[PDB]
């Protein structure tokens, strides 16, 4: 009973069973500051049964540094009371409550307990009870640029899925008598040692088809072993194998035991000596707070730092830690004790929310057990950070001034950023910018662009939008919401509904870009990313890229004149199937789904467009005849969609659907078997239907079968929609109409000058004149997966399952069909939060203008297995041109709008290079091998005139530059690369 209209993207990450079990779990959250509220938001969006908050502390001003559900009118009110009302709106299925008193026994009501901003003694008191009652306990902490997470799910945690990957499946060629299984040609099983697999449809070894899992010994990328199968047979041919994933038993240790000898999880292998330091530092922080009436060390205070270091040494001696304490790092932790950054809060909130989902669903591998993280490279160095500048000023940014200072706050407030896209990452980025006070100064400004509209399925991870906001524009809603969150941003956000691309350069031109400070991409396709990257490279602006997929995420930074661009690296391309496999010989459900999609498009989209275009253009016939690869099929489509097979009622639609069923599932298979009989052999004597080719069988229509009826209903409904007739749904009419059907005879054909033209003319004159049909138009069927009342996914599923029945392939349900046909990208809220946190941690580095490449970090992570990694960006390549050092990416030539001959002479004279090719856009302006007459014609013209002539289109009024790519040779004839040319118009 899961609402698939809301959790559509999340179910592809977790699953039906996982969410079913998750929806019966209770979560308690202690602490409602930025980290606590972030965790609560992620949990509420995830869909647990309920959430309870406990935080009786009165609100203070500095708490607004990272709490986006608190306003300056709520000072002096308990945080839980003022946060629950706003949290209850995120998800209608997740009630949110507040408890004003916490007793130990009460903890028995909850499946998971999350603890933040609580002293260590209370944490020990809670854990001593939660450990022995089998209650998941998660404790999180965020101090300035440092963070810690601790997980304890009990001594007998059972993990059903470990890596979160789909089970591997494959087709076997042969199984020897010693269990040596071999895959088909150029196919990798991908298994590891110790895995379990089960076989099916194996010929010659029926014993392996029972279903008993067996061990796997990977002997190579294409072959593996399972052991001895002597008794079950001698050799096995063909068959399929599927991986079996077995549960794992994980044992956690209580907090009291874990303090003595922790087990760390390292987010960065470049600094493996720090977590031992942080373990002492955080305990020293807790002890210091307990020894000063719950007061953290004052920012950048030397006396407090010395006392904190004394506490650290005392703890190190007490715990018998054989580590040498690094005074600088520990005192850095002491200085930033009162810091409260929204970026760290978002990062840790995403991580902890994922851990909570793991605890409730018993899925994925959790952290075991300590996770200490820092981003100390983000501390500004171009401003004065001292005790006098980091003191609080009684404003809402105190939690950030305590780390960065007032001068860096002024630097942040003067940013002029540009955010592309307003998806989930866009919403998180806007929230972080609002909290950080970005562009709240006199010279600040924010611009956001996105052309999409809010849909129901977007509410699962885009928290700035509400069900009342469905149908509106994403940019407007996000801008309004963030203006509500931070009133200082009112009138400093501009929202556009324009798509960023080659057709929108009139708005995002030179004037727009020359005033920016950085560009942040929040897109979901590679083309737009590359376009924005090229624009940023041309204008020399920092760029921040980020991407998510299910539980995986990555973030990258592009810095002018320092690092390489986004487009200097490759990514794996999308896989497409060969046309021959899809057309006649499928062997996977994906092939049938693709074929069903093509059938849908060809039945309900293309003929309608042809008919409409014929009725619109007065002379469409000539264009169709002289342009279409198959004009006669176009004429046939027009004829049989206008006159011959035009329906007049719904019964005719049902009969048409039956006829199409016969055409596509009974006759084509008979023709194929006539061409390639089941007993046929290839040229080498081997049977034709062996291996990846499966012998099909015709389908005889049977009304009692569910799939046949589903296909008939879907096809009839879509045809009626095309012709705009009323469509019935009661099966009685379908049974009555289809009962009295007499199939025409069919016999496969064996095959065997000016007649074709005669037939074309006969068809042409049979068509009624367009004059006789004025105002009559047919509605094409535009594919739309997200709507469940249009019979699109139903038709695709029915056709795919019928074709699978033709070729003996296991059919897929509607869920998987929707996933495959719609090309849905799995998405999650936790991954979005983590990537936004990382990007905002890089943003402060960009603002400070760090000039060294060892200070920036590109991040990759996978939350399913708890993997984090960071790596420095790749420096832009250099080269030598005319005895000078030239950056390959960020350098360009600035030339006036001079003649082509003058350009060639300039290059020959200054650089000593001979120009051989000069192109602009996708046109070849000048080439060395062109005939002399053409060059003489094109030589004395200016560059702008040459471009206008070649492209046969005038330059736009707003064009202020031209980007030309030039290939030139040196004096010796050796090709030398040169940077592009920026002609100034």
């Amino acid at each position: 009973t899961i609402d698939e209209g809301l959790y559509s993207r999340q179910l592809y990450v977790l699953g039906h069973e996982a969410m079913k079990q998750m929806s019966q779990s209770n979560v308690l959250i202690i602490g409602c500051k930025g980290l606590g509220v972030e965790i609560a938001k992620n949990v509420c969006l995830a869909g647990v049964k309920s959430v309870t908050l406990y935080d009786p502390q009165p609100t203070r001003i500095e708490d607004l540094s990272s709490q986006y559900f608190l306003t300056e009118d709520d000072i002096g009110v308990p945080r839980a009371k003022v946060t629950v009302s706003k949290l209850a709106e995120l998800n209608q299925y997740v009630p949110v409550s507040v408890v004003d008193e916490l007793s130990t026994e009460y903890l028995k009501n909850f499946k998971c307990v999350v603890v933040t901003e609580t002293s260590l003694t209370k944490q020990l008191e809670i854990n001593d009870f939660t450990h022995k009652n089998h209650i998941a306990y998660i404790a999180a902490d965020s101090r300035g640029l440092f963070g810690s997470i601790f997980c304890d799910f009990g001594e007998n945690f059972i993990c059903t899925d470990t890596d979160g990957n789909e089970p591997l499946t494959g087709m076997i060629a042969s199984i020897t008598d010693d269990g040596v299984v071999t895959m088909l040609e150029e196919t990798r099983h991908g298994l590891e040692n110790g895995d379990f697999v089960k076989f099916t449809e194996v010929k010659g070894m029926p014993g392996l088809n029972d279903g008993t899992p067996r061990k796997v010994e990977v002997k190579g990328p294409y072959t593996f072993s399972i052991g001895s199968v002597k008794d079950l047979g001698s050799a096995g041919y063909n068959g399929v194998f599927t991986q079996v994933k077995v549960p794992t038993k994980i044992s956690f240790k209580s907090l009291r035991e874990s303090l003595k000898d922790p087990e760390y999880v390292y987010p960065d292998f470049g600094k493996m000596m720090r977590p031992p330091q942080y373990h002492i530092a955080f305990q020293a922080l807790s002890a210091f707070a307990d020894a000063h009436e719950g007061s953290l060390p004052r920012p950048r205070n030397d006396i407090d730092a010395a006392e904190f270091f004394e506490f650290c040494k005392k703890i190190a001696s007490t715990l018998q830690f054989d580590v040498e304490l690094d005074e600088k790092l520990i005192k850095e932790i002491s200085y930033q004790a009162r810091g409260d950054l929204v970026a760290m809060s978002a990062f840790l909130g995403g991580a902890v929310a994922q851990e909570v989902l793991k605890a409730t669903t018993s899925k994925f591998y959790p952290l075991k057990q300590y996770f200490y993280f820092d981003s100390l490279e983000s501390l500004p160095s171009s401003v004065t950070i001292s005790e006098e500048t980091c003191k609080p000023r009684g404003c809402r940014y105190d939690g950030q001034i305590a780390v960065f200072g007032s001068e860096f706050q002024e630097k942040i407030a003067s940013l002029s950023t540009f955010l592309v896209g307003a998806g989930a990452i866009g919403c998180e980025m806007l929230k972080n910018w609002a909290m950080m006070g970005v562009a709240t100064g006199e010279s600040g400004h924010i611009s956001v662009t996105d052309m999409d509209s809010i849909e129901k399925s977007n509410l699962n991870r885009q928290f700035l939008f509400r069900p009342r906001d469905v149908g509106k524009l994403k940019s407007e809603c996000a801008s309004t919401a963030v203006s509500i969150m931070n009133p200082s941003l009112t009138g400093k956000i501009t929202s556009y509904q324009e798509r960023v691309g080659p057709e929108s350069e009139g708005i995002f031109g030179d004037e727009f870009f020359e005033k920016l400070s950085l560009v942040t991409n929040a897109l979901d396709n590679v083309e737009a990313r590359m376009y924005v990257d090229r624009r940023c490279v041309f204008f020399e602006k920092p760029l921040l890229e980020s991407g998510t997929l299910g539980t995986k995420g990555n973030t990258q930074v592009v810095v002018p004149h320092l690092t390489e661009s986004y487009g200097s690296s490759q990514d794996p391309p999308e896989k497409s199937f060969p046309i021959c496999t899809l057309k006649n010989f499928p062997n996977r459900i994906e092939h049938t789904i693709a074929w069903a999609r093509d059938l849908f498009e060809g039945l309900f989209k293309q003929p309608i467009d042809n008919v409409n275009m014929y009725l619109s253009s007065p002379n469409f016939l000539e264009t169709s005849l002289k342009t279409s690869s198959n004009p006669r099929e176009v004429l046939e489509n027009i004829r049989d969609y206008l006159v011959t097979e035009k329906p007049l009622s719904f019964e005719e639609c049902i009969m048409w659907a039956r006829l199409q069923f016969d055409k596509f599932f009974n006759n084509n298979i008979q023709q194929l078997l006539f061409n390639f009989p089941k007993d046929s052999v290839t040229s080498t004597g081997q049977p034709f239907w062996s291996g990846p080719k499966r012998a099909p069988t015709p389908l005889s229509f049977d009304i009692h079968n569910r799939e046949h009826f589903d296909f008939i209903v879907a096809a009839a409904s879509l045809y009626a929609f095309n012709y705009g007739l009323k469509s019935e749904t009661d099966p009685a009419i379908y049974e009555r109409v289809l009962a009295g059907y007499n199939p025409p005879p069919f016999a496969p054909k064996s095959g065997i000058a000016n007649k074709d033209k005669q037939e074309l003319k006969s068809i042409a004159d049979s068509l009624p004149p367009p004059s006789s049909l004025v105002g009559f138009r047919l509605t094409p069927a535009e594919f739309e997966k997200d709507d469940d009342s249009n019979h699109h996914i139903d038709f695709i599923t029915a056709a795919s399952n019928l074709r699978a029945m033709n070729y003996d392939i296991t059919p897929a349900d509607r869920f998987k069909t929707k996933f495959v046909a719609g090309k849905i990208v799995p998405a999650m809220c936790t991954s979005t939060a983590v990537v936004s946190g990382l990007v905002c941690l890089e943003l402060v580095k960009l603002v400070d203008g760090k000039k060294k490449i060892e200070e920036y970090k590109n991040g990759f992570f996978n939350l399913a297995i708890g993997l984090f990694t960071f790596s420095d960006p790749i420096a832009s390549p250099k080269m030598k041109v005319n005895g000078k050092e030239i950056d390959k990416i960020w350098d360009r030539y600035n030339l006036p709008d001079c003649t082509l001959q003058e350009l060639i002479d300039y290059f020959q004279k200054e650089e000593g290079l001979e120009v051989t090719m000069l192109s602009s856009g996708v046109s070849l302006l000048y080439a060395n091998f062109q005939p002399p007459k053409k060059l003489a014609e094109r030589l004395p013209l200016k560059i702008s005139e040459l471009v206008e002539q070649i492209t046969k289109k005038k330059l736009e009024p707003f064009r202020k530059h031209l980007v030309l790519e030039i290939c030139c040779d040196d004096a010796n004839g050796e090709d030398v690369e040169v940077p592009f040319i920026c002609i100034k118009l």
């Binding site: 292998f269 990452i425 991407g547 990555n554 990537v835 990694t869």
Partner: protein, 76 residues
């Protein structure tokens, strides 16, 4: 010398190399064991992304070292 490469999807790969081997040889071995073209492979060790043209000794990679094979994601 034996090294381990961990994929972003959780898979682990064992490679037999020598200190003098270049990054291109390692990428070729990874392609052989996985089919990933060398131009699309992103190897990270100790916070440094390995670049073509250099040797393992340049990155101080020793026996039982751990590398991470990562990739970029198009969603978001």
């Amino acid at each position: 010398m034996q090294i381990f490469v961990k994929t972003l999807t959780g898979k682990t790969i064992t490679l037999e190399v020598e200190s003098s081997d270049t990054i291109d040889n390692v990428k070729s071995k990874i392609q052989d064991k996985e089919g990933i073209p060398p131009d699309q492979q992103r190897l990270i060790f100790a916070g440094k992304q390995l670049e073509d043209g250099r040797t393992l000794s340049d990155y101080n990679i020793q026996k039982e070292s751990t590398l991470h094979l990562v990739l970029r994601l198009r969603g978001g």
